[PDB]
Ligand binder design. Structure first.
Ligand SMILES: *[C@@H]1O[C@H](CO)[C@@H](O[C@@H]2O[C@H](CO)[C@@H](O[C@@H]3O[C@H](CO)[C@@H](O)[C@H](O)[C@@H]3O)[C@H](O)[C@H]2NC(C)=O)[C@H](O)[C@H]1NC(C)=O
Ligand SMILES: *[C@@H]1O[C@H](CO)[C@@H](O)[C@H](O)[C@H]1NC(C)=O
Lengths: 164, 293
């Protein structure tokens, strides 16, 4: 338990970070939401298949100190493990984007969000593409929108682990 | 000329005064009969003689219900393209300018899309999933029904149609990878248009109003509500947030409570509660107001 506060803070640090994005990066299709939802963990993630409550699994055909000691499930263990790999993947991308952004003004990545993904990664644990100035801004926005949806999934899981 | 239905055809016209209308022949659906006559629903008398009747379609008068003489029927529909863009005249947009407003009360897969009609005569609607690609979510929709509740916008009231849709239930996923791509075909008399939309359930979630709103006097009152029954379960996973005000997502003079209850201070006032997804900044519920003693 207690990993809920870290997921909530990650939700807060991400939301006010995307607010910093769609504000500074105006007219970049960032606020327009026309940017395609691009999952960067799609190749090696089991989050969407496993991070679901056991009540929804009605058909047979379908570590870290965050899992509740009262209820242990292999599917929930896979969920927490996949969440860790997702955060690490986003950490490496964000750190690389931040290097290019720090040199070139309009946008800067929140240090609170960067330390929030790491503190939640540690509780779960118990090389980057090439882009030009205009393109590195677009990439950050596409990542932030997908990262917001992923943190929402993490918060649903952590809320489900607590109080149940 | 492309085939929308067996005896209903749609012809696309450049809708430019100099452009020549497309010339396409239509024959009577009876093969062996000879010495027939032809009429149109916009003409009084006979206008054809042969077993096959050529036609040049530049204007709306050149379209209609062409009936043999009653051996068979054929219908012509026009889809205007003006300067390369297709007409959007049958439907009326909302203030958002979206022509299709979809919303889901939960994450089950059910959702309803609604649209406004400028002018409600001889309207036929057909909505379906717009992508046949294998990597595409399948959605089956029912038939469209007119709503007794009209909609007002820009000092004018419009009639509203809606349809209930349901994603073909697969094994559950925690997120949505690909968007739901729908397409609507609208058919005013002798006019064809089609409108399309793409959305994620996570963005169309509009929670139903809170239920069982009660209040108990405190030292200062404790206002208590309950999650909507239409909302997804488990409520622990599908957490909701609640905005409360005393007297979408307006939240003017309103405060947030992530629990089913809070303690407010009011005299002779009316307390209101709305709901929303606790994590995704989706649409907010309608207000469930109640007076405060
Ligand atoms: C929305 O409206 C547009 C324009 O009316 C539709 O596009 C048209 O769709 C029809 C039927 O799919 C096409 O007919 C086909 O044309 C090909 C041309 O080679 C022919 O080989 C086929 O036998 C058939 O007759 C038509 O070409 C096409 N026109 C354009 C300009 O794209 C569209 O299908 C409607 N629906 C959606 C979801 O967009
Ligand atoms: C469970 O199996 C039944 C029967 O095969 C099927 O109708 C239903 O859609 C399945 N549910 C899921 C979530 O796959």
């Amino acid at each position: 338990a207690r990993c809920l506060s870290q997921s909530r803070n990650l939700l807060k640090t991400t939301d006010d970070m995307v607010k910093t994005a769609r504000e500074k990066l105006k007219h970049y299709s960032c606020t327009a939401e026309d940017i395609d939802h691009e999952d960067i963990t799609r190749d090696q993630t089991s989050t969407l298949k496993t991070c679901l409550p056991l009540e929804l699994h009605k058909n047979e055909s379908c570590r870290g100190s965050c899992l509740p000691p009262q209820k242990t499930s292999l599917m929930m263990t896979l969920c927490l493990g996949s969440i860790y790999e997702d955060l690490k993947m986003y950490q490496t991308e964000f750190q690389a984007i931040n290097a290019a952004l720090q040199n070139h003004q309009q946008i800067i990545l929140d240090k609170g969000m960067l330390v929030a993904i790491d503190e939640l990664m540690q509780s779960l644990n118990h090389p980057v593409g090439e882009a030009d100035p205009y393109r590195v801004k677009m990439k950050l926005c596409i990542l932030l929108h997908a990262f917001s949806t992923r943190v929402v999934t993490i918060n649903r899981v952590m809320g489900y682990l607590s109080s149940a | 000329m492309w085939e929308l239905e067996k005896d209903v055809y749609v012809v696309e016209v450049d809708w430019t005064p100099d452009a020549p209308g497309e010339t396409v022949n239509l024959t009577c659906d009876t093969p062996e009969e000879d010495d027939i006559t032809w009429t149109s629903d916009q003409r009084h008398g006979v206008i054809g003689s042969g077993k096959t009747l050529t036609i040049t379609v530049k204007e709306f008068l050149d379209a209609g219900q062409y009936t043999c003489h009653t051996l068979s029927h054929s219908h012509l529909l026009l889809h205007k393209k003006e300067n390369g863009i297709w007409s959007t005249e049958i439907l009326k947009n909302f203030k958002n300018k979206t022509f299709l407003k979809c919303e889901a009360p939960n994450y089950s897969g059910r959702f309803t899309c609604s649209w406004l009609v400028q002018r409600n005569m001889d309207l036929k609607f057909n909505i379906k999933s717009s992508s046949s690609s294998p990597d595409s979510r399948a959605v089956t929709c029912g038939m469209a029904s007119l709503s007794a509740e009209k909609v007002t916008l820009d000092q004018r009231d419009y009639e509203k149609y809606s349809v209930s849709c349901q994603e073909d239930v697969t094994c559950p996923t925690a997120e949505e990878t690909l968007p739901i791509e729908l397409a609507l075909e609208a058919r005013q008399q002798n006019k064809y248009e089609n409108y399309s939309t793409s959305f994620f359930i996570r963005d169309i979630i509009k929670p139903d109003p809170p239920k069982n709103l009660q209040m108990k006097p405190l030292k200062q009152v404790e206002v208590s509500w309950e999650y909507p029954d239409s909302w997804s379960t488990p409520h622990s996973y599908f957490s909701l947030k609640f905005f409360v005000r005393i007297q979408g997502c307006n939240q003017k003079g309103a405060f947030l409570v992530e629990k089913t209850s809070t303690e407010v201070q009011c005299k002779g006032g009316n307390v209101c509660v709305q709901a929303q997804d606790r994590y995704y900044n989706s649409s907010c519920s309608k207000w469930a107001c109640v007076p405060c003693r």
